[PDB]
Design a protein around this ligand. Structure first.
Ligand SMILES: *[C@@H]1O[C@H](CO)[C@@H](O[C@@H]2O[C@H](CO)[C@@H](O)[C@H](O)[C@H]2NC(C)=O)[C@H](O)[C@H]1NC(C)=O
Ligand SMILES: *[C@@H]1O[C@H](CO)[C@@H](O[C@@H]2O[C@H](CO)[C@@H](O)[C@H](O)[C@H]2NC(C)=O)[C@H](O)[C@H]1NC(C)=O
Ligand SMILES: *[C@@H]1O[C@H](CO)[C@@H](O)[C@H](O)[C@H]1NC(C)=O
Ligand SMILES: *[C@@H]1O[C@H](CO)[C@@H](O)[C@H](O)[C@H]1NC(C)=O
Ligand SMILES: *[C@@H]1O[C@H](CO)[C@@H](O)[C@H](O)[C@H]1NC(C)=O
Ligand SMILES: *[C@@H]1O[C@H](CO)[C@@H](O)[C@H](O)[C@H]1NC(C)=O
Ligand SMILES: *[C@@H]1O[C@H](CO)[C@@H](O)[C@H](O)[C@H]1NC(C)=O
Ligand SMILES: *[C@@H]1O[C@H](CO)[C@@H](O)[C@H](O)[C@H]1NC(C)=O
Ligand SMILES: *[C@@H]1O[C@H](CO)[C@@H](O)[C@H](O)[C@H]1NC(C)=O
Ligand SMILES: *[C@@H]1O[C@H](CO)[C@@H](O)[C@H](O)[C@H]1NC(C)=O
Ligand SMILES: *[C@@H]1O[C@H](CO)[C@@H](O)[C@H](O)[C@H]1NC(C)=O
Ligand SMILES: *[C@@H]1O[C@H](CO)[C@@H](O)[C@H](O)[C@H]1NC(C)=O
Lengths: 418, 202, 50, 86
């Protein structure tokens, strides 16, 4: 079939019609990013020549190719620890949550460490981790999964107990509901909306978090982005190893068989063929790892940016910290990567109102100081743009600039003076 | 070590060139690494074989060098793009991106020229000497719920004030720095206080 | 069949006709001793970077 | 250690900031002799959180930090024919 690009949706546009959300939902979305790559290390001489002295001596005729290859892989291995550090080690102190988790109805039990498990991982982190001979060795990460989990929990503790202040200076404690109120202001929604609907908001939040764990559990492909990295590197190593079975024109792919059959004057020729082929195979591997490493580095840099802007603060960048109006984010540790739970404010249940650019009163043009002028069909009100809350139009929520003969579409109404 | 980031680039390129040059001393299976020695000893029918070995090895060495320079160039390009972004957002403006223009609240930045690079001096505002206050989401007065227009309601233990969130500056709570929304029976943790009306005296 | 490594008793159930085995790398990792018909596993001698 | 066998470094219980990374949470430093330890991730800091307590800065400082970025690379040029054939 010819693919659909999405459902068609006409907007009820007119020169005096505005839609304003009378409700909203709290949505939590998951963003999964690769941070690090398996720190592989290949011993060039052993890969090519094994323990053969005769081959090793011939390998030296090629100069320092093996030094370059060993060096390139070492450089990658170092980068991988740098990548992890840049993303997770963004907090100087290891912050702890209080013994009593009273956050005004907000339940963080699925993102905070579960004390009953030796791994000290959150219920979600636990789920994320559950989902994902020839001179070839693998080096361990500098930071163990436990240490990465500790960094994550510190970031969570800071985010929950001191908002974003710990990401700028010292951690300044603040009631969670009050923190959320500030985050509402940050998206153009007045703080009273948070408090008046605090119970609803906490419930929508708690529900959304529960959905995250269920979504990940029931969606095996959810962490494909991390699994793809693992698969690509495993595939690269398997290919590199398989190349040792190739003859490359030699009488045998086995160096020991050549040496047991032939004298040096003839063995050299057969060995040279294996060296050329195996050296070429190793160069191919390293080149691909350098290119792949660059991609991982870019991802790690993106993850580090999100850690700073989505977790250690509130972003005003659209689609940077989830789809919707960013409120806050919570990091979760994952296998060779990081998972961000983005908490966004999403407008809901909008309705049509008649609007005007200004109100005409006593010959003066009055403009809304913060909101927009709307009519329910009989009366004009001024309300905040992101949430329907129809206030009486007064001199304390409007300002005057010019007369009524300038503004196009200006309407006649009363402006109340307290 | 402060400029290690710039020195590392210099070292990597110098190292790459040194390696490329050293490869000219390799035989690659030839009787000699020196092309002139091969030509002075052998006739074309035999020299060709020895030369071909040097060409293969040297061509391979040069291809290795160039590939590494292309990959390395990509890293430098990315860094330059980041530097250009910071020049625009940290120097030619004030950033609201956390940790983008230094650690703290970005005020401004000043660029400085450096060897094959740029150095940014990030001037940030860093909060200091905080103290504990008792706070409330709203003040209850005359049955109405009053919320702070800009700051936060805080108590020093006996009196309630409204102050800007990033710097302690305890103002009297008045109708000119709060707004009303709903009654006192909705907000959780609302506290009783007086909200001063500047018009009441007149 | 020559090489260097550590010979240990194998728990691999070779069929009556199989003389040696290979791993996923397609390299010998087990042999049948030509005199005793004992199956031996072959592992590389301890190695690693320093 | 999980990174291999470390010989010559004295293992201690005290955790410090990482100096020379070994791997798997282990770092080494010169303190005199070389010692090995599990790296610290930073000092622990509990926040005095409660449902009605806020901290507000009564002062501030002006901090200047330095960020150093590479912009350009040496513009090398290699004559392929001359390099190979002179
Ligand atoms: C926070 O939410 C968790 C669930 O995610 C609550 O734990 C559940 O508590 C009920 C009892 O009310 C048990 O039947 C469930 O088996 C528990 N589930 C899990 C995963 O532990 C937890 O009690 C909530 N905390 C608060 C303060 O409400
Ligand atoms: C705004 O939407 C929320 C749901 O997102 C409404 O809350 C639900 O109300 C129904 C009853 O109609 C209950 O059965 C649900 O359990 C409630 N959900 C939650 C999370 O509490 C809310 O009433 C709506 N508000 C307005 C003004 O429409
Ligand atoms: C506004 O009116 C149009 C009809 O002109 C209707 O299609 C649209 O759904 C209405 N919008 C809302 C939010 O009710
Ligand atoms: C508009 O709002 C006012 C005040 O609540 C109400 O009295 C009036 O009936 C409303 N008009 C319509 C058409 O709903
Ligand atoms: C909208 O267009 C109509 C003409 O169809 C015009 O009469 C009306 O004044 C316009 N209103 C505004 C706000 O432009
Ligand atoms: C508004 O009222 C004035 C009279 O004060 C009148 O002249 C003007 O035409 C009216 N404008 C509209 C859009 O009704
Ligand atoms: C607030 O009080 C706690 C004790 O409950 C204390 O540890 C903390 O340092 C105080 N904060 C400030 C800024 O004085
Ligand atoms: C709170 O501030 C007021 C006004 O400066 C002062 O009179 C009062 O003594 C202060 N209370 C405490 C506990 O410091
Ligand atoms: C804080 O919790 C206590 C119970 O320990 C409760 O009495 C008090 O009203 C709560 N205050 C707020 C602002 O939630
Ligand atoms: C605030 O004062 C009212 C009386 O006007 C009283 O009914 C209410 O319980 C008081 N609330 C608090 C938290 O003191
Ligand atoms: C000779 O080899 C056979 C295996 O083919 C074995 O069964 C037999 O016992 C061996 N005899 C001696 C003396 O080793
Ligand atoms: C570290 O502490 C353990 C006890 O938990 C002790 O047995 C061990 O000897 C100590 N090691 C050193 C050298 O500090």
């Amino acid at each position: 079939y010819t693919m659909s690009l999405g459902a068609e949706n006409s907007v009820a546009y007119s020169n005096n019609s505005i839609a304003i959300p009378t409700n909203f939902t709290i949505s939590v979305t998951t963003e999964i990013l690769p941070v690090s790559m398996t720190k592989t290390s290949v011993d060039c001489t052993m890969y090519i020549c094994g323990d053969s002295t005769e081959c090793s001596n011939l390998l030296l005729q090629y100069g320092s190719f093996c030094t370059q290859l060993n060096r390139a892989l070492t450089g990658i291995a170092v980068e991988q620890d740098k990548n992890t550090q840049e993303v997770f080690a963004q907090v100087k102190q290891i912050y702890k949550t209080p013994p009593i988790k009273d956050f005004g109805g907000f339940n963080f039990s699925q993102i905070l460490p579960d004390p009953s498990k030796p791994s000290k991982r959150s219920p979600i982190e636990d789920l994320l981790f559950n989902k994902v001979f020839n001179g070839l060795t693998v080096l361990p990460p500098l930071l163990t999964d436990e240490m990465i989990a500790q960094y994550t929990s510190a970031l969570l503790a800071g985010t929950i107990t001191s908002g974003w202040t710990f990401g700028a200076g010292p951690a300044l404690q603040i009631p969670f509901p009050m923190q959320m109120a500030y985050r509402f202001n940050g998206i153009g929604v007045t703080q009273n909306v948070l408090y008046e609907n605090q119970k609803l908001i906490a419930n929508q939040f708690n529900s959304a978090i529960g959905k995250i764990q269920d979504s990940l559990s029931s969606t095996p492909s959810a962490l494909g982005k991390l699994q793809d990295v693992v698969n690509q590197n495993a595939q690269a190593l398997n290919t590199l190893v398989k190349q040792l079975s190739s003859n490359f024109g030699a009488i045998s792919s086995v160096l020991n068989d050549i040496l047991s059959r032939l004298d040096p004057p003839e063995a050299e020729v057969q060995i040279d063929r294996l060296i050329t082929g195996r050296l070429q195979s190793l160069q191919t591997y390293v080149t691909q790892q350098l290119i792949r490493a660059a991609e991982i580095r870019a991802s790690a840099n993106l993850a580090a940016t999100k850690m700073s802007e989505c977790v250690l603060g509130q972003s005003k960048r659209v689609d940077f910290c989830g789809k919707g109006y960013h409120l806050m984010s919570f990091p979760q540790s994952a296998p060779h990567g990081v998972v961000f739970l983005h908490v966004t404010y999403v407008p809901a249940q909008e309705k049509n109102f008649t609007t005007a650019p200004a109100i005409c009163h006593d010959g003066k043009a009055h403009f809304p100081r913060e909101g927009v002028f709307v009519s329910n069909g009989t009366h004009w009100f001024v309300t905040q743009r992101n949430f329907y809350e129809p206030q009486i139009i007064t001199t304390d929520n409007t300002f005057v600039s010019g007369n009524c003969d300038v503004v196009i579409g200006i309407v006649n109404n009363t402006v109340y003076d307290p | 070590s402060a400029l290690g980031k710039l020195q590392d680039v210099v070292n990597q390129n110098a190292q790459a060139l040194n390696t490329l040059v050293k490869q000219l001393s390799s035989n690659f299976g030839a009787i000699s690494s020196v092309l002139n020695d091969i030509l002075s000893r052998l006739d074309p029918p035999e020299a060709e074989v020895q030369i071909d070995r040097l060409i293969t090895g040297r061509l391979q060495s040069l291809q290795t060098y160039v590939t590494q320079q292309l990959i390395r160039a990509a890293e430098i390009r990315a860094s330059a793009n980041l530097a250009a972004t910071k020049m625009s957002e940290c120097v030619l403006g004030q950033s609201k991106r956390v940790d983008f223009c230094g650690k703290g609240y970005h005020l401004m930045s000043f660029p400085q020229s450096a060897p094959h690079g740029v150095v940014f001096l990030h001037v940030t505002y860093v909060p200091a000497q905080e103290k504990n206050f008792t706070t409330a989401p709203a003040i209850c007065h005359d049955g109405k719920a009053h919320f702070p227009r800009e700051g936060v309601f805080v108590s020093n233990g006996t009196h309630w004030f409204v102050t800007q969130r990033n710097f302690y500056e305890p103002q009297i709570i008045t109708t000119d720095n709060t707004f009303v929304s709903g009654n006192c029976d909705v907000v959780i943790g609302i506290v009783n206080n007086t909200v001063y009306d500047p018009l009441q005296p007149e | 069949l020559t090489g260097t490594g550590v010979l240990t008793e194998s728990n691999k159930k070779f069929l009556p006709f199989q003389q040696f085995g290979r791993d996923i790398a397609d390299t010998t990792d087990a042999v049948r001793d030509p005199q005793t018909l004992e199956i031996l596993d072959i592992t590389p001698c301890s190695f690693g970077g320093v | 250690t999980r990174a291999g066998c470390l010989i010559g470094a004295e293992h201690v219980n005290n955790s410090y900031e990482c100096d020379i990374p070994i791997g798997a949470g282990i770092c080494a430093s010169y303190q005199q002799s070389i010692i090995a330890y599990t790296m610290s991730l930073g000092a622990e800091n509990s926040v005095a959180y409660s449902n009605n307590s806020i901290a507000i800065p009564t002062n501030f400082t002006i901090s200047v930090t330095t960020e150093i970025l590479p912009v350009s690379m040496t513009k090398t040029s290699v004559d392929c024919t001359m390099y190979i054939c002179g």
